[PDB]
Protein backbone atom coordinates (compact mmCIF):
# COMPACT_ATOMS: atom_id res chain seq x y z
CA UNK A 1 0.00 0.00 0.00
CA UNK A 2 1.80 2.79 -1.31
CA UNK A 3 -0.97 5.81 -0.24
CA UNK A 4 -1.77 4.03 2.52
CA UNK A 5 -5.83 4.27 1.12
CA UNK A 6 -6.16 0.40 2.43
CA UNK A 7 -6.06 -0.63 -1.34
CA UNK A 8 -2.96 -3.01 -2.53
CA UNK A 9 -0.98 -1.33 -4.92
CA UNK A 10 -1.58 -3.68 -7.82
CA UNK A 11 -5.65 -3.05 -7.14
CA UNK A 12 -5.16 0.72 -6.88
CA UNK A 13 -6.37 2.56 -10.26
CA UNK A 14 -4.78 5.52 -8.95
CA UNK A 15 -1.47 4.24 -6.80
CA UNK A 16 -0.14 8.05 -5.82
CA UNK A 17 -3.33 9.21 -4.54
CA UNK A 18 -5.33 7.75 -1.16
CA UNK A 19 -8.99 7.02 -2.22
CA UNK A 20 -11.38 5.09 -1.91
CA UNK A 21 -12.13 1.07 -2.24
CA UNK A 22 -15.45 1.64 -4.38
CA UNK A 23 -13.68 3.47 -6.99
CA UNK A 24 -10.33 1.11 -6.99
CA UNK A 25 -8.08 3.25 -4.89
CA UNK A 26 -9.36 6.90 -6.25
CA UNK A 27 -10.70 9.47 -4.58
CA UNK A 28 -14.49 10.76 -4.91
CA UNK A 29 -13.30 14.73 -3.43
CA UNK A 30 -16.89 16.04 -3.74
CA UNK A 31 -18.74 13.12 -2.45
CA UNK A 32 -20.99 12.62 -5.03
CA UNK A 33 -20.25 9.07 -6.03
CA UNK A 34 -18.28 10.14 -8.96
CA UNK A 35 -14.38 9.72 -8.62
CA UNK A 36 -12.55 12.87 -9.60
CA UNK A 37 -10.98 11.43 -12.89
CA UNK A 38 -14.59 10.93 -14.11
CA UNK A 39 -16.41 13.84 -12.53
CA UNK A 40 -16.19 17.17 -14.76
CA UNK A 41 -17.00 19.26 -11.69
CA UNK A 42 -14.63 17.44 -9.19
CA UNK A 43 -15.81 20.02 -6.46
CA UNK A 44 -19.36 20.09 -6.81
CA UNK A 45 -21.69 17.40 -6.28
CA UNK A 46 -24.06 16.54 -9.67
CA UNK A 47 -25.83 13.57 -10.90
CA UNK A 48 -24.00 10.83 -13.09
CA UNK A 49 -26.45 12.11 -15.76
CA UNK A 50 -24.19 15.31 -16.28
CA UNK A 51 -20.97 13.12 -15.50
CA UNK A 52 -21.24 14.74 -11.49
CA UNK A 53 -21.85 18.09 -12.77
CA UNK A 54 -25.30 19.86 -11.31
CA UNK A 55 -28.41 21.10 -13.45
CA UNK A 56 -28.75 24.00 -11.37
CA UNK A 57 -32.37 25.28 -13.19
CA UNK A 58 -33.05 21.61 -14.16
CA UNK A 59 -32.90 22.33 -18.01
CA UNK A 60 -31.15 19.09 -18.88
CA UNK A 61 -28.25 20.82 -19.18
CA UNK A 62 -25.61 21.12 -16.39
CA UNK A 63 -24.78 24.44 -15.33
CA UNK A 64 -20.88 24.64 -17.04
CA UNK A 65 -22.46 24.09 -20.33
CA UNK A 66 -24.87 26.31 -19.85
CA UNK A 67 -25.24 29.84 -21.13
CA UNK A 68 -27.82 30.93 -18.64
CA UNK A 69 -27.20 28.36 -15.40
CA UNK A 70 -30.05 30.00 -13.48
CA UNK A 71 -32.95 30.08 -16.15
CA UNK A 72 -34.53 27.16 -17.72
CA UNK A 73 -33.68 27.31 -21.74
CA UNK A 74 -33.85 25.11 -24.86
CA UNK A 75 -30.55 23.32 -26.05
CA UNK A 76 -30.66 25.36 -29.07
CA UNK A 77 -30.16 28.42 -27.71
CA UNK A 78 -27.50 26.57 -25.08
CA UNK A 79 -29.75 26.66 -21.90
CA UNK A 80 -30.51 30.27 -22.54
CA UNK A 81 -34.86 30.58 -23.05
CA UNK A 82 -36.56 32.35 -26.11
CA UNK A 83 -39.87 32.68 -23.61
CA UNK A 84 -42.00 34.39 -26.79
CA UNK A 85 -40.58 31.95 -29.08
CA UNK A 86 -39.30 34.84 -31.78
CA UNK A 87 -36.12 32.91 -32.48
CA UNK A 88 -34.14 35.27 -29.78
CA UNK A 89 -33.31 34.80 -26.58
CA UNK A 90 -34.72 36.40 -23.70
CA UNK A 91 -31.33 38.42 -23.34
CA UNK A 92 -31.17 39.79 -26.07
CA UNK A 93 -34.62 40.10 -26.80
CA UNK A 94 -35.93 43.96 -26.14
CA UNK A 95 -38.88 42.84 -25.77
CA UNK A 96 -38.83 39.03 -23.76
CA UNK A 97 -42.65 38.14 -23.53
CA UNK A 98 -43.51 39.34 -27.51
CA UNK A 99 -42.61 38.05 -30.37
CA UNK A 100 -40.75 40.55 -32.85
CA UNK A 101 -37.91 41.14 -35.84
CA UNK A 102 -34.61 40.77 -34.99
CA UNK A 103 -34.79 44.44 -36.94
CA UNK A 104 -36.26 45.62 -33.97
CA UNK A 105 -34.36 43.99 -31.30
CA UNK A 106 -37.15 41.35 -30.28
CA UNK A 107 -39.70 43.94 -30.20
CA UNK A 108 -42.53 44.53 -32.49
CA UNK A 109 -42.80 47.64 -34.66
CA UNK A 110 -44.57 50.30 -32.32
CA UNK A 111 -47.50 52.08 -33.59
CA UNK A 112 -47.33 55.56 -30.96
CA UNK A 113 -50.46 57.65 -31.89
CA UNK A 114 -52.38 54.32 -33.10
CA UNK A 115 -53.80 55.20 -36.33
CA UNK A 116 -52.28 51.71 -38.20
CA UNK A 117 -49.07 53.03 -39.52
CA UNK A 118 -46.11 51.91 -38.04
CA UNK A 119 -43.45 54.32 -36.77
CA UNK A 120 -41.26 53.31 -39.01
CA UNK A 121 -44.01 54.07 -41.94
CA UNK A 122 -45.61 56.95 -40.10
CA UNK A 123 -44.36 60.55 -41.46
CA UNK A 124 -46.36 61.73 -38.59
CA UNK A 125 -45.49 59.29 -35.79
CA UNK A 126 -47.33 61.39 -33.07
CA UNK A 127 -50.03 62.63 -35.06
CA UNK A 128 -53.20 60.40 -36.10
CA UNK A 129 -53.53 59.97 -39.96
CA UNK A 130 -54.80 57.82 -42.51
CA UNK A 131 -52.42 55.64 -44.43
CA UNK A 132 -53.38 56.92 -48.03
CA UNK A 133 -51.09 60.18 -46.36
CA UNK A 134 -48.56 57.91 -44.60
CA UNK A 135 -49.96 58.58 -41.81
CA UNK A 136 -49.91 62.41 -41.67
CA UNK A 137 -53.17 64.28 -40.99
CA UNK A 138 -55.64 65.81 -43.64
CA UNK A 139 -58.67 68.31 -42.78
CA UNK A 140 -61.60 66.21 -43.99
CA UNK A 141 -64.77 67.34 -45.27
CA UNK A 142 -66.77 69.61 -42.73
CA UNK A 143 -63.16 71.09 -41.83
CA UNK A 144 -62.67 71.68 -45.05
CA UNK A 145 -65.41 73.91 -45.35
CA UNK A 146 -64.78 75.45 -42.10
CA UNK A 147 -61.04 76.07 -43.64
CA UNK A 148 -63.01 78.08 -46.24
CA UNK A 149 -65.13 80.06 -44.11
CA UNK A 150 -62.16 81.40 -43.07
CA UNK A 151 -61.03 82.17 -46.31
CA UNK A 152 -64.45 84.30 -47.18
CA UNK A 153 -63.93 86.60 -44.67
CA UNK A 154 -60.63 87.51 -46.27
CA UNK A 155 -61.51 91.22 -46.97
CA UNK A 156 -59.70 93.40 -50.36
CA UNK A 157 -59.60 97.10 -51.33
CA UNK A 158 -62.57 97.33 -53.96
CA UNK A 159 -60.59 96.68 -57.44
CA UNK A 160 -57.62 96.23 -56.04
CA UNK A 161 -55.65 92.60 -54.44
CA UNK A 162 -54.42 94.42 -50.89
CA UNK A 163 -55.27 92.55 -48.19
CA UNK A 164 -57.63 94.32 -46.03
CA UNK A 165 -55.47 95.10 -42.12
CA UNK A 166 -59.02 93.85 -40.82
CA UNK A 167 -58.50 90.77 -42.04
CA UNK A 168 -55.19 90.09 -40.79
CA UNK A 169 -56.49 88.26 -37.60
CA UNK A 170 -58.70 85.64 -39.40
CA UNK A 171 -55.35 85.02 -41.74
CA UNK A 172 -53.92 84.31 -38.78
CA UNK A 173 -55.91 81.59 -38.00
CA UNK A 174 -55.56 80.46 -41.56
CA UNK A 175 -52.04 79.88 -40.82
CA UNK A 176 -52.37 77.62 -37.39
CA UNK A 177 -55.24 75.48 -39.43
CA UNK A 178 -52.54 75.07 -42.00
CA UNK A 179 -49.59 75.06 -39.78
CA UNK A 180 -51.48 71.87 -38.07
CA UNK A 181 -51.22 69.92 -41.23
CA UNK A 182 -47.41 70.47 -42.38
CA UNK A 183 -47.10 67.86 -44.88
CA UNK A 184 -50.42 68.71 -47.40
CA UNK A 185 -50.96 71.08 -49.96
CA UNK A 186 -52.74 73.87 -50.99
CA UNK A 187 -54.68 76.15 -53.23
CA UNK A 188 -55.13 79.34 -52.82
CA UNK A 189 -57.95 80.52 -55.12
CA UNK A 190 -59.09 83.74 -56.16
CA UNK A 191 -62.88 83.81 -57.40
CA UNK A 192 -65.42 86.65 -58.73
CA UNK A 193 -68.76 87.00 -59.73
CA UNK A 194 -69.85 87.18 -63.67
CA UNK A 195 -70.61 90.84 -63.45
CA UNK A 196 -68.07 93.09 -65.15
CA UNK A 197 -65.41 92.05 -67.96
CA UNK A 198 -63.96 88.66 -67.37
CA UNK A 199 -60.47 89.01 -68.70
CA UNK A 200 -60.21 91.88 -65.75
CA UNK A 201 -61.37 89.65 -63.12
CA UNK A 202 -58.96 86.80 -63.86
CA UNK A 203 -56.15 89.02 -63.67
CA UNK A 204 -57.56 90.05 -60.57
CA UNK A 205 -57.79 86.58 -59.18
CA UNK A 206 -54.71 86.44 -59.33
CA UNK A 207 -53.12 88.46 -58.13
CA UNK A 208 -55.62 88.21 -55.03
CA UNK A 209 -54.80 84.74 -54.72
CA UNK A 210 -51.01 85.28 -55.13
CA UNK A 211 -51.49 87.95 -52.48
CA UNK A 212 -53.17 85.65 -49.63
CA UNK A 213 -50.16 82.97 -50.81
CA UNK A 214 -47.82 85.73 -49.68
CA UNK A 215 -49.33 86.66 -46.28
CA UNK A 216 -49.43 82.62 -45.63
CA UNK A 217 -45.59 82.45 -46.75
CA UNK A 218 -44.66 85.72 -44.31
CA UNK A 219 -46.55 83.64 -41.77
CA UNK A 220 -44.28 80.89 -41.54
CA UNK A 221 -45.89 78.56 -44.63
CA UNK A 222 -43.65 76.91 -47.11
CA UNK A 223 -43.77 78.23 -50.14
CA UNK A 224 -43.78 74.92 -52.38
CA UNK A 225 -46.60 74.03 -50.08
CA UNK A 226 -48.67 76.66 -51.58
CA UNK A 227 -50.25 77.47 -55.55
CA UNK A 228 -51.90 80.55 -56.32
CA UNK A 229 -54.87 80.34 -58.90
CA UNK A 230 -56.90 82.74 -60.37
CA UNK A 231 -60.61 81.66 -61.35
CA UNK A 232 -62.58 84.75 -61.95
CA UNK A 233 -65.72 83.96 -62.75
CA UNK A 234 -64.86 79.93 -63.80
CA UNK A 235 -66.20 78.30 -60.47
CA UNK A 236 -69.95 80.12 -59.19
CA UNK A 237 -71.21 78.14 -55.76
CA UNK A 238 -73.88 80.60 -56.23
CA UNK A 239 -76.40 81.81 -58.81
CA UNK A 240 -74.66 85.42 -60.64
CA UNK A 241 -78.61 86.77 -61.18
CA UNK A 242 -78.86 87.97 -57.82
CA UNK A 243 -76.61 89.96 -55.32
CA UNK A 244 -76.91 87.59 -52.66
CA UNK A 245 -75.53 85.08 -55.09
CA UNK A 246 -72.97 87.22 -56.89
CA UNK A 247 -71.78 87.95 -53.03
CA UNK A 248 -71.27 84.41 -52.36
CA UNK A 249 -69.09 83.86 -55.73
CA UNK A 250 -66.47 86.74 -54.71
CA UNK A 251 -64.64 84.88 -52.77
CA UNK A 252 -61.21 83.06 -51.78
CA UNK A 253 -60.94 79.74 -51.43
CA UNK A 254 -57.73 77.39 -49.72
CA UNK A 255 -58.37 73.94 -50.90
CA UNK A 256 -56.24 70.91 -49.99
CA UNK A 257 -54.79 69.54 -53.23
CA UNK A 258 -54.93 65.80 -52.78
CA1 LIG B 1 -3.27 2.18 -2.03
CA1 LIG C 1 -4.90 5.03 -4.28
CA1 LIG D 1 -17.19 13.28 -7.19
CA1 LIG E 1 -19.00 16.53 -9.01
CA1 LIG F 1 -29.31 23.91 -16.65
CA1 LIG G 1 -30.36 27.39 -18.44
CA1 LIG H 1 -37.65 35.74 -27.88
CA1 LIG I 1 -39.55 39.30 -28.30
CA1 LIG J 1 -48.85 55.55 -36.30
CA1 LIG K 1 -49.41 59.36 -37.64
CA1 LIG L 1 -53.84 75.15 -61.16
Request: some cysteine; overall charge negative.
Amino acid sequence: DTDKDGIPDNKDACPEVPGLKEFNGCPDTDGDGIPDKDDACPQVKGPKEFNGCPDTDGDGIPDKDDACPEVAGPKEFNGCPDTDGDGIPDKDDKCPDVAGPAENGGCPWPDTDGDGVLDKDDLCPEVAGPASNKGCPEPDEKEQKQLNQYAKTILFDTGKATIKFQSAEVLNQIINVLKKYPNSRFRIEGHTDSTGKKAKNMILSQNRADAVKVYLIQGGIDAGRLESQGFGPEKPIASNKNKKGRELNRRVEINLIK
